[PDB]
RNA sequence: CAUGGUUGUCGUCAGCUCGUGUCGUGAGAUGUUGGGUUAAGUCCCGCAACGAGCGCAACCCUUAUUGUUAGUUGCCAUCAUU
């Protein structure tokens, strides 16, 4: 990936001064306007060892889960995830997602099980109220659920954008020691991380370019 | 004031809990809280919670209109008689 890619994205924005965490000195270029500037330089050879790390976990068929329900980052997410062939979240992050992946597995097996039952024909067999309730049901299960109802075991990896708005998920990662490669920003923790990627988190631009840079590592590994 | 069974009572009030997960050294907590909404823990939304159970509601009886099958021991409009 490019200099100048990265700089057109609008990579190099961090956040406020007032709000970054003092970790992220390590990667921080200069402040400008009262805002920071990561280290593009930094960042390329960075991206480069996510890169090549991810295709490492793809050619050993792992599983990889992309999270992320910022506004931005939630479509990008979604959109490589699914290019790549791999799970994705990005509306809302359920406690015990990984943690609770036996309960929630019975929730997986609902939102199967409803699916087949349209197809089947139960559904015409419906009295109204019962056809018009399981179709709500669907829609949440879809809804939290659908980018990881086919997911076969925990992850091997998870990415994560902005990992100090995905809370949970980093804290779910840890407890599985599942290795993560996330977007960071000046404001984030880079210790929490196994792979840092510093980036802005809140250009949408920037977000695509580097959720795709990581698609296309799983896809290449594959 | 050894008990089973039966019953009163708060009160037909909307509550009482469990599984898994997570938090806390621990008793415990979370969920069951919060924004709305409801008669309701009723429902929606959000949420380190995701579900479930006993409740709530529904399924039940009766009452309020009516189609149809039946037409006596019931009914009498159409008819004639008492
Ligand atoms: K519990
Ligand atoms: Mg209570
Ligand atoms: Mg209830
Ligand atoms: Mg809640
Ligand atoms: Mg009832």
Redo the contacts with the bound molecule.
């Keep these: 990936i490019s200099m100048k890619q990265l700089l057109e994205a609008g990579v190099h924005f961090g956040h406020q001064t007032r709000r970054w965490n003092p970790k992220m000195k390590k990667y921080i270029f200069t402040e400008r306007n009262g805002i920071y500037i990561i280290d593009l330089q930094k960042t390329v050879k960075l991206v480069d060892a996510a890169y090549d790390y991810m295709k490492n976990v793809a050619e050993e068929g792992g599983v990889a889960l992309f999270v992320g329900?910022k506004k931005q980052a939630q479509e990008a997410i979604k959109d490589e995830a699914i290019r790549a062939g791999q799970y994705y979240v990005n509306?809302?992050?359920?406690?015990?997602?990984?943690?609770?992946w036996?309960?929630?597995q019975?929730?997986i097996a609902?939102l199967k099980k409803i699916n087949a039952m349209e197809e089947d024909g139960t559904f015409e067999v419906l009295p109204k109220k019962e056809v018009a309730?399981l179709n709500?049901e669907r829609?949440?299960?879809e809804k939290?659920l659908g980018g990881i109802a086919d997911m076969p075991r925990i992850p091997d990896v998870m990415y994560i954008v902005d990992p100090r708005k995905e809370?949970?998920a980093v804290?779910?990662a840890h407890?599985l020691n599942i290795p993560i490669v996330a977007m960071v920003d000046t404001n984030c923790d880079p210790d929490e991380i196994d792979v840092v990627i510093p980036s802005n988190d809140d250009a949408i631009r920037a977000v695509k370019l580097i959720t795709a840079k990581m698609a296309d590592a799983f896809i290449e590994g594959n």
């Design positions: 329900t509306h809302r992050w359920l406690g015990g997602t990984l943690t609770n036996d309960t929630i019975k929730r609902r309730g709500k829609e949440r299960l939290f809370r949970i804290q779910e407890k």
